[PDB]
Amino acid sequence: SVPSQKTYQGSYGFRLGFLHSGTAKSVTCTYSPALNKLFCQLAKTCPVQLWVDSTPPPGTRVRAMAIYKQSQHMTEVVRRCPHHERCSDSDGLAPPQHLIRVEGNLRAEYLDDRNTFRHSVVVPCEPPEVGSDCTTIHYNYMCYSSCMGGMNRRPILTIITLEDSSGNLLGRDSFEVRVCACPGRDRRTEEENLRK
Ligand SMILES: CN1CCC(Nc2cccc3c2cc(C#CCNc2ccc(C(C)(C)C#N)nc2)n3CC(F)(F)F)CC1
Ligand SMILES: [Cl-]
Ligand SMILES: [Zn+2]
């Protein structure tokens, strides 16, 4: 079964935000608003901002899940490739098959859905730190988009869901992801492509 990707702000006005990191050759993560697409390097920090108009209840959580963007691939579970699932690089929380990890949160939980076999990672959410206006989650993507036998050059979306403590939907947003060696050049190219 395919989870919904429909944007849904919900009662709390939930939506994502991204830093403005530019497209320099050295950038490790960069987001294209024009493409709604995040470009990032393998296993590097990807900051994703969480925004709401009003604070949801304590016990609200935020889940990330990858799905293939193309129609003929969306029912296939997005997972790490045969090489990376075997490279013994788990931090002790993330199963080695999971593409998306959360960096720097010991309360991250990883789900293998018993019915759909899809992977997700979920963390508690908290109000912003003093002097900040949003919360930030640090994600890591653990395969390249080009990894053969995994994503296999197929585009993916990350679906971010705001959930109550039972897992019921409160909000949903999403963005395309390319995991690549030079995010800055690839963002410029695809943006110049779109422009042409
Ligand atoms: C004008 N107002 C606009 C919205 C601003 N608040 C936010 C702005 C941006 C992000 C925000 C928030 C709030 C949350 C959150 C949560 C859920 N947990 C949680 C835990 C503990 C507690 C307390 C009360 C301390 C306890 N006990 N209350 C909630 N988040 C994260 C989320 F939901 F977006 F992921 C505040 C000002
Ligand atoms: Cl930018
Ligand atoms: Zn891989």
Author numbering: 96 to 291
Question: What's the paper's own text on this?
Answer:
pmcThe tumor suppressor protein p53 is a critical transcription factor that regulates cellular responses to stress. More than 50% of human cancers harbor mutations in the TP53 gene that encodes the p53 protein, and most of these are missense mutations occurring in the DNA binding domain of p53 (amino acids 94–292). The amino acid substitution creates a pocket in the p53 Y220C mutant protein that renders it structurally unstable at physiological temperatures. Rezatapopt (also known as PC14586) is a small molecule reactivator of the p53 Y220C mutant and is being evaluated in clinical trials.
As the lead compounds gained potency, with SC150 values reaching below the 100 nM threshold, X-ray crystallization studies confirmed the binding mode of the lead compounds. The crystal structure of compound 10 complexed with the p53 Y220C mutant protein was successfully determined at 1.70 Å resolution. The p53 Y220C mutant protein used for X-ray crystallization trials consists of the DNA binding domain spanning amino acids 94–312, which was stabilized by four additional mutations (M133L, V203A, N239Y, N268D). The X-ray structure confirmed that compound 10 binds the p53 Y220C mutant protein within a central cavity that is created by the tyrosine-to-cysteine substitution in the p53 Y220C mutant protein, with the indole moiety occupying this space and the trifluoromethyl group extending deeply into the hydrophobic pocket. This enables a favorable CH-π stacking interaction of the aromatic ring with Proline-153. Two key hydrogen bonds between the p53 Y220C mutant protein and compound 10 were observed: one interaction with the carbonyl of Cysteine-220 and another with the side chain of Threonine-150. Our molecular modeling predicted that the side chain of Threonine-150 within the p53 Y220C protein would form a hydrogen bond with the ligand. This interaction helped to orient the ligand in the binding pocket of the p53 Y220C mutant protein and enhance other interactions such as hydrophobic and van der Waals interactions. The trifluoromethyl group had a favorable interaction with the sulfur atom of Cysteine-220, also reported by Fersht et al. for the carbazole series.
